[PDB]
Structure formats: structure tokens, C-alpha cells
Amino acid sequence: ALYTLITPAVLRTDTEEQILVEAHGDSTPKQLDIFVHDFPRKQKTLFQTRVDMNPAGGMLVTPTI
């Protein structure tokens, strides 16, 4: 019932960065995708992945974008 997303304020490039996807109150396990587009228009995806968020992991997932 509360999905949060925490990235660094200034994302470096050519660097394996960590973000933080979190779900407070939901426990139905999910498969959820992360897309990294550009700002002004939806351009080519700079990154694209898929990570799974299960309550055995604590309903938080830390992808490596």
C-alpha cells in the first residue's frame, strides 16, 4: 500500500549504481521492470532489467542500474 523508490540525487554514468525499490504493506510477490529513458521525450532505453520482489527478501529490492 506504499511503494517507494530511492535513487541517488545525481546519477553517474558508466558506473554500476544502486537504487532502492520498496513496498510497505503489500506481500503479494511481484515481477517488476525498471526502465531508464531520457528526460525530454521517451528515447531509447539506456537500461532495462527485471527484478523480483518477494517477502522472503523483505519486499525490497536493490537493482544495479
Side-chain angles (χ1 to χ4, degrees):
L2 180 62
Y3 304 97
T4 79
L5 160 71
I6 290 178
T7 66
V10 174
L11 270 168
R12 265 89 168 256
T13 185
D14 267 9
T15 319
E16 172 209 309
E17 293 280 346
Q18 267 206 58
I19 67 165
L20 171 61
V21 171
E22 189 159 19
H24 304 273
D26 200 340
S27 293
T28 81
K30 296 158 156 54
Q31 308 213 21
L32 72 162
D33 316 287
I34 286 93
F35 299 92
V36 182
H37 302 276
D38 305 346
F39 167 67
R41 50 189 184 269
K42 178 201 284 201
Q43 275 307 102
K44 56 178 289 290
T45 70
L46 310 185
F47 195 74
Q48 178 177 359
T49 173
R50 150 163 288 168
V51 285
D52 298 332
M53 186 176 63
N54 42 5
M59 286 311 273
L60 85 167
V61 59
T62 63
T64 38
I65 77 156

